[PDB]
Amino acid sequence: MASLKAKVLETFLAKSRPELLEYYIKVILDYNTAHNKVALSECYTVASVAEMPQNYRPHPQRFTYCSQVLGLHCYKKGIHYWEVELQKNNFCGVGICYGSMNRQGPESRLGRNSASWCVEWFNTKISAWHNNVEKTLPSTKATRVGVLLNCDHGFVIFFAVADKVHLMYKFRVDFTEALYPAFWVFSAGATLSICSP
Ligand SMILES: *CC(=O)N1CCCN(C(=O)c2ccc(-c3ccccc3)c(C)c2)CC1
């Protein structure tokens, strides 16, 4: 149903922030996945860089190579929106990934494998990543990203969220398994906050 999928994508690309909030889902960070450099706070809604490594209990799902963390729930059907506040001028990333993504080694890095899609702030520049292919984006003064995941018609949209929403990047994928919200923090004081609007 290519025509219907294209129309739906066009509709969501043009939605305002109030309209995106109609698809809001509450995302919670999953302690079992957090790398030891990722500190969690505020009832698991805030991820920040720990200056010293923590000593989290071993778990097969825990990231051991990249300082990343996933949401608690995955999505295989429906439409989902969530927003992440970021501290400005930091190395960090917001994305989505399949549960089957590796949790160990360089293959676990968001956007550097076939199983994940993200936008990333890296050396004050903004890029979109999937399958180890980088796309440079124009800078934004927004300190908030909105992720619109449409499982039913196969796309994810990353919005820069300010007084209005602006497109950062989108991907069309016929997703093959459920998706987790995914997060990367690296620079000192980098912080990703799942907002409650
Ligand atoms: C994916 C991840 O978080 N890792 C842990 C951190 C180090 N690492 C890197 O691959 C990595 C090396 C160098 C930089 C960097 C720092 C400052 C300027 C430019 C690049 C980064 C951001 C990551 C292994 C995996």
Numbering used by the authors: -1 to 195
Please quote the authors directly:
TRIM25 is a member of the TRIM family of RING-type E3 ligases and comprises a canonical N-terminal tripartite motif (TRIM) and a variable C-terminal PRYSPRY substrate binding domain. TRIM25 has been reported to ubiquitinate a number of different substrates, possibly in some cases mediated through RNA binding, including RIG-I,15,17,18 DDX3X19 and ZAP,20–22 with diverse roles in immune regulation, cancer signalling pathways and antiviral activity. We sought to assess whether the E3 ligase TRIM25, reported to catalyse the formation of both Lys48- and Lys63-linked ubiquitin chains, could be liganded and repurposed for targeted protein ubiquitination. As the majority of current proximity-inducing small molecules for E3s recruit substrates to the physiological substrate binding component (e.g. the substrate adaptor of Cullin RING E3s),11 we focused our efforts towards liganding the PRYSPRY substrate binding domain of TRIM25.
A crystal structure of the TRIM25 PRYSPRY-compound 10 complex was solved at 1.8 Å resolution, which, to our knowledge, represents the first published structure of TRIM25 in complex with a small molecule. Analysis by intact protein LCMS revealed Cys498 as the site of covalent modification by compound 10. Multiple sequence alignment of all PRYSPRY-containing TRIM proteins showed that Cys498 is not conserved across the family (ESI†). Thus, the covalent targeting of Cys498 by compound 10 reveals a unique binding mode for TRIM25. The biphenyl ring system of 10 forms π-stacking interactions with the aromatic side chains of Phe523, Phe554, Trp616, and Phe618. Furthermore, the carbonyl of the Cys-linked acetamide bond of 10 acts as an H-bond acceptor for both the side chain hydroxyl and main chain –NH of Ser499, and the side chain indole amine of Trp616. The carbonyl of the diazepane amide linker also forms an H-bond interaction with the terminal guanidino group of Arg541. Interestingly, structural overlay of TRIM25 PRYSPRY-compound 10 with the PRYSPRY domains of TRIM7, TRIM21 and TRIM58, for which small molecule ligands have been reported, showed that the ligands all bind at the same site on the PRYSPRY surface, which has also been suggested to be a substrate binding interface (ESI†). The meta position on the pendant phenyl ring was determined to be both solvent accessible and synthetically tractable. Interestingly, the rate of TRIM25 auto-ubiquitination was significantly increased by compounds 10 and 11 (ESI†).
